[PDB]
Amino acid sequence: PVSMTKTSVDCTMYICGDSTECSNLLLQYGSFCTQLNRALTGIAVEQDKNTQEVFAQVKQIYKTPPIKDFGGFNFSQILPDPSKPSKRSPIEDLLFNKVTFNGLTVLPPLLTDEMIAQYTSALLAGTITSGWTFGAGPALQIPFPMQMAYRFNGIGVTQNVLYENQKLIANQFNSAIGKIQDSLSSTPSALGKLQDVVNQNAQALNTLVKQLSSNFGAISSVLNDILSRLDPPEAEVQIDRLITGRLQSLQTYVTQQLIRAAEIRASANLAATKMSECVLGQSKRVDFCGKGYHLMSFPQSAPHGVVFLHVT
Amino acid sequence: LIANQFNSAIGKIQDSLSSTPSALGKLQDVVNQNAQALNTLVKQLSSNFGAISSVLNDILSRLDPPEAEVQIDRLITGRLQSLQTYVTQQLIRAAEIRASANLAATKMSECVLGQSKRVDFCGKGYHLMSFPQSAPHGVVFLHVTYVPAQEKNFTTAPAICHDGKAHFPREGVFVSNGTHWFVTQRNFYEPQIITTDNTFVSGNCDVVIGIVNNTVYDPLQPE
Amino acid sequence: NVFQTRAGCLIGAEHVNNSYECDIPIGAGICASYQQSIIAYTMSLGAENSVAYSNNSIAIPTNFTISVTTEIL
Ligand SMILES: *[C@@H]1O[C@H](CO)[C@@H](O[C@@H]2O[C@H](CO)[C@@H](O)[C@H](O)[C@H]2NC(C)=O)[C@H](O)[C@H]1NC(C)=O
Ligand SMILES: *[C@@H]1O[C@H](CO)[C@@H](O[C@@H]2O[C@H](CO)[C@@H](O)[C@H](O)[C@H]2NC(C)=O)[C@H](O)[C@H]1NC(C)=O
Ligand SMILES: *[C@@H]1O[C@H](CO)[C@@H](O[C@@H]2O[C@H](CO)[C@@H](O)[C@H](O)[C@H]2NC(C)=O)[C@H](O)[C@H]1NC(C)=O
């Protein structure tokens, strides 16, 4: 996971609805509403920073040549598909298909899904056509078999091993790629990690909304009923109890969101490190870029996340 | 040339730091967040929270304990909630700062005390070294890196066929300038004559795809 | 004048058809900047580039630059 849904809750409208008496009573507590709005805004900005750090690591937007022949390696399952009206690779399409008021608003992300798809396409094109050079300066073209010979030499295997089995290795690579697309389609629990974030945020919002129907000791959970059944001198007490309960509920939601945002940002920093090391280069770190000796990686965009295909 | 480039880079870095006031925005953000949290905590002292007055002295000097107890209790509840909120926010921000400090310590251990092969961990490019610098409530790393430039265009071959044997480059890569073939290191164009001491033999010229015919110099034939 | 974005309704910004880097993030790929008035446009992800790739061509650097960068933590 890279980022979560950017939510913003109006403290005044949530606590008091559209009642001026409740707003005047709410002003007695100081600047609680300002703090809550500020914290939610900070989380919302941090989500855009997470997505920018993960995907926006290259300056240029590289493109693959129209004639796609890389010595037998077949990247059709990860390169963008122009036939679909989404410019997504088939695996990206499968990933996007597997994942399923009261002052509450959902701010759209700064980067559209098409923009993240373009960043992923640029990374894939750069890796395919220039190896790891484009991540440390100018993009230097190199035949893909020669690049894979370099990566074979990087794990203690002489490059003559690759060439003498070139058409064999390509076959294995292609087969492995195909199997990935099958497994994701046959397993509904493959993308559980992203679904956990989605479910947690949705359930937190549902509980926050459901807290509006609690009496909290007042005669009713509807503010308009209290206003329409009583006059201010003793309606103020009931409204005060409702204000205290709703304010505590909003405070709990804000604290939970801050903790979960810290967790999500930690995961986003890990994803950025893996994009810098596994994708833009070859890593000698054990188990950092998958089981075995790392050869290369391919990033793929996913709804609120990133999927790495580690070739080892 | 390398010494001149290093000195020019250091001078440019100093000039960029001096001329840009927003360069050190991270530390300023931390300081502003802490100061603003303190200001909000202090400002919370002036809220009634439902009591007749926000000053304890007024309630003490105006009301007897039996009825002033309610006002003091309301003020206590409000101020306690404000302080708890402040402490929770401080704990979260302290965790954030601890994570940042752990990352800074890792960067100091791996970029400064040694040379790191991790990509983009110690600056853009091929990391050469790093220099630490103290900053108020922070650290600034000067990542010195090697950036290749002025690339040029070449015809390459996976191996060289000679005497019915395939020769692969021992360390570099085979290149062609149009008519002749040389072998050069991958990160710098230093062409050299393809000999038997910079290539190794493996198999014949039938398996490799893209092999080309060329002559491999032997340092023993002259003698 | 009036511009409708996926992030709402923007008033007072003249929608501009050219793309630049993001200055003030509006949302949904829309960014606003001051040129002299306020313009709203679609953010640009970077300069277009297509490195010439062929099965027997390699590009090798011939000379180099030593670059120093700052990182603040
Ligand atoms: C690259 O791999 C893809 C895998 O889909 C191949 O595309 C399929 O090719 C078969 C014929 O071999 C067609 O029946 C399918 O409809 C194709 N699928 C798609 C999505 O186009 C593709 O041919 C491979 N490329 C090469 C050069 O072998
Ligand atoms: C490719 O490199 C070869 C080898 O350096 C060049 O051949 C040399 O050319 C110069 C200038 O004409 C002569 O003085 C040398 O005697 C040649 N050396 C040899 C060993 O024959 C060749 O000109 C280069 N080709 C191109 C197109 O740059
Ligand atoms: C590279 O040289 C080899 C010989 O060293 C060439 O192989 C010859 O190819 C011809 C034409 O097919 C055959 O009649 C000969 O019998 C082959 N000779 C040997 C020794 O096998 C090869 O064709 C050359 N490659 C290129 C691209 O010209």
Ligand SMILES: *[C@@H]1O[C@H](CO)[C@@H](O[C@@H]2O[C@H](CO)[C@@H](O)[C@H](O)[C@H]2NC(C)=O)[C@H](O)[C@H]1NC(C)=O
């Ligand atoms: C590598 O690039 C450097 C610049 O970083 C070149 O240095 C310049 O060389 C020219 C030609 O003599 C001089 O006019 C400049 O004053 C030099 N600049 C500096 C900063 O010293 C260097 O020549 C390049 N090397 C090659 C082989 O092209």
Ligand SMILES: *[C@@H]1O[C@H](CO)[C@@H](O)[C@H](O)[C@H]1NC(C)=O
């Ligand atoms: C190498 O040749 C290609 C041929 O299309 C050209 O476009 C490219 O710019 C060349 N590279 C350099 C560095 O001159």
Ligand SMILES: *[C@@H]1O[C@H](CO)[C@@H](O)[C@H](O)[C@H]1NC(C)=O
């Ligand atoms: C490169 O492609 C050409 C066709 O454009 C083909 O004739 C040649 O054999 C290929 N070379 C290699 C090394 O694959």
Ligand SMILES: *[C@@H]1O[C@H](CO)[C@@H](O)[C@H](O)[C@H]1NC(C)=O
């Ligand atoms: C942008 O180009 C479109 C064509 O799709 C044109 O209709 C529109 O007027 C253009 N907008 C501006 C501001 O030039």
